[PDB]
Symmetry: D2
Subunit: 258 residues, 4 copies
């Protein structure tokens, strides 16, 4: 299936590892031009692989919580390419800020998660209009299921779903589609590192995986990326405002199944 993404310029936030890295790599494979915005430099191996598929792919160091850096990085991207065709809002962290944590911790969580999705759309949308481009917001099942000690991240991820509907309405006349992908349990190096802090990492991984209905396994970053890149493409030309769950049945299938 030709996604018609050749030479389309797409910014991917947190685009050098995990879900974001898989999205950047998939974009390169579809002959698009991914532009990675991330705090820390990508691995050499990642950059080598990306450049091999798409020599024009770029990486810009960006602290997304710094509004001026978002502004300037988008400006640099437009200066380089003259156009923007997509934005994937993906950077985030489940920072475990519960009800008990208080205002400052809650607001800091909104800065880490929610506020830069808005900032990035704010700076990208004026350019997406010209190309009838697209936005994909990566959210989390926690936006609708809860988790229990993560008010900051939950609030952020839910606001991202709401903003997906809002921006779809706002941009309908410009032909700019806005959709979300909702993962549940996705195996990434960061998740693997977190699991490694447990007494028995293999048992902890198995305990989490056991609850995923389809195959009792984690979703892969590639699985998230395939749906996200489909949504960026005109193959999804009448899909806007939607929340696509790519989660092995985690959110919607009977909790009682084993």
């Amino acid at each position: 299936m030709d996604l018609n993404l050749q030479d389309k310029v797409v910014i991917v936030t947190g685009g050098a590892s995990g879900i974001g890295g898989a999205i950047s790599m998939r974009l390169a494979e579809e002959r698009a031009i991914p532009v990675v915005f991330a705090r820390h430099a990508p691995d050499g191996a990642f950059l080598d692989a990306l450049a091999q598929r798409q020599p024009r792919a770029t990486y810009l160091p960006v602290e997304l919580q710094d509004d001026a850096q978002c502004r300037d990085a988008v400006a640099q991207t437009i200066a380089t390419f003259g156009r923007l065709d997509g934005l994937v809002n993906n950077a985030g962290v489940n920072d475990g800020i519960g009800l008990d944590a208080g205002r400052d911790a809650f607001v800091a969580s909104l800065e880490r998660n929610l506020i830069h999705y808005y900032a990035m759309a704010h700076y990208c949308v004026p350019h997406l209009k010209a190309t009838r481009g697209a936005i994909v917001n990566i959210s989390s099942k926690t936006a609708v299921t809860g988790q229990g000690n993560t008010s900051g991240y939950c609030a952020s991820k839910g606001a991202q779903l709401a903003l997906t509907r809002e921006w779809a309405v706002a941009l309908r006349e410009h032909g700019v589609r806005v959709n979300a992908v909702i993962p549940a349990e996705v195996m990434t190096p960061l998740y693997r590192n977190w699991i490694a802090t447990f007494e028995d990492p293999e048992a902890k991984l198995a305990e989490i995986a056991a609850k995923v209905p389809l195959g009792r396994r984690f979703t892969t970053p590639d699985e998230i990326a395939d749906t996200a890149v489909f949504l960026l493409s005109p193959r999804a030309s009448h899909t806007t405002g939607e929340w696509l769950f790519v989660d092995g049945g985690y959110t919607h299938l009977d909790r009682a199944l084993v």
Copy 2:
């Protein structure tokens, strides 16, 4: 139907007008004790009518965006009554902060809407546990439908739905239920005043009302209040994490109907 809310102490934010006022009044009618947190003093007729139903009902002047004022007003409420049985998070404003407004405007919208729902829950929850009390979060259809030039409000209202699920999970063992009510178009004095700024206020009102499937009319504050107060009561003793739409069919019925 006996709601068993007699002598139960319930804080209602923005509780002296519109939806909040109707919730306070219904609470008083059920012989609960509403405690109004609002920036401005309620009008005299409101206070008289409230006291007539419930002499112990109180008002505290509170700027909800000031964390210390939330903290101190909750403390004052505990000092006066010795207990807390419910929290209704209701204060908000649709401030029309679009994609083009930028960071400072978007964050200010979060402060006006989202952040004080968290602050109030943060300060109230430790007390609600002792009484196996309840929370109701008043949201907005815009959280799921979008509207188009109100990113700040939409994000806030969607985060409030997500937090409803989150807090329901967090507090399940303590028997504290958390639910949301989602209005669409509700006629209030403030809405009436906004409409009065148009060239032809009556035609504008008609334009909006024509789109509400059930009766082609606005929902009333009392209609919102009756579902909200039901949700505060042990009549809703196995309802938690839910979003109840009270909207005349606005959100879910075929857009094509006249």
Copy 3:
């Protein structure tokens, strides 16, 4: 909270035990007049308690799968009371008809679960229009969660949610509201017919216990009342968090 249901005539299908029984009992407590349509006679204790609350409460023996019996029982209800103010579609059975069962078994499940919700609405709607009455359809979380080995029941319960939206649209200009309640795990005779219990109870997030028929009834009766006067087309989940809260919680 006054529900203003006094003297309102409400048919409750399967209304003499479990969820249906609690709905009838709650209606009687609110001084409404429940009219139980069910295949088998209610037990004496149920009738004693029901009549103590509402002496005019009635039971009519009805095989809901017989269209003629539905028609005639609605007519009999109108002959006795002169009006109809509510319909609660509730009768059903999780009959475990899976993918391997075949057409005939699947269709039989639709007859046992779905088709009489339509038939009852068909015969009741003209009377409900006259009183600007209300419908509540009792569905099941299985409509949205699935379960396994129960295609017939799941299809039926999902169709009932769809019909709730459809009838809400169809009847909006007549002021007849139509809503659904979605239970998950509720202790009833149907349930015991369907250890495994303790295992299932542990999976209900709120209190690790089954929902009570009384809890389902309180929401169902609220939805019949003018306290829900701008609620139509809605699906109210009364399930202790079963459907919507994180599957991983203990």
Copy 4:
């Protein structure tokens, strides 16, 4: 994007026109082998175009309301191809059976719309297990929005959404994914009253195309959707979920 559907055998019910036809054609383009089950023979122009893309694609005349024809047509497909990799349940008709119509008309609507989705799954699932294949159920926005005067179709379409969740659960351990696509307004043979309706579609004020429905359906059949199961994908230009008040 390689969908890895090459030589995969997929039955498409009502697969010779409208949405079904577009799904069959897209499958052929992706080098899958669509097998059209439909009441009437497709037109020669369609068959020519289908053969140009996939010479192995076939059509079988099937009255889906006849359980035996379903059984025998599935058997013939397995005899011919040796495998089944996908089922697309799509055949149906909005037959306008309302509250006033009565039992017989309502049940006839269920036969026309709902019952053959079950029948086809019943006969296809053993073969789908063998290939770790997939099912896509095409539903309708009416399942969640209502419409008026169409209880039969609405009930059927809602049951199909429920069955998507049910079969996803039932078949999880066998690696068989089950998903649904929910169109709203799509210009087809089954489909000023028109200008009125198109104006209400938020994205572009125009109907969704069969090609758009097909692109999502075929993606869902493919291993690119390897951890998607039980889901309802709305492909509707924002019809179901965006603010009703927008112009």
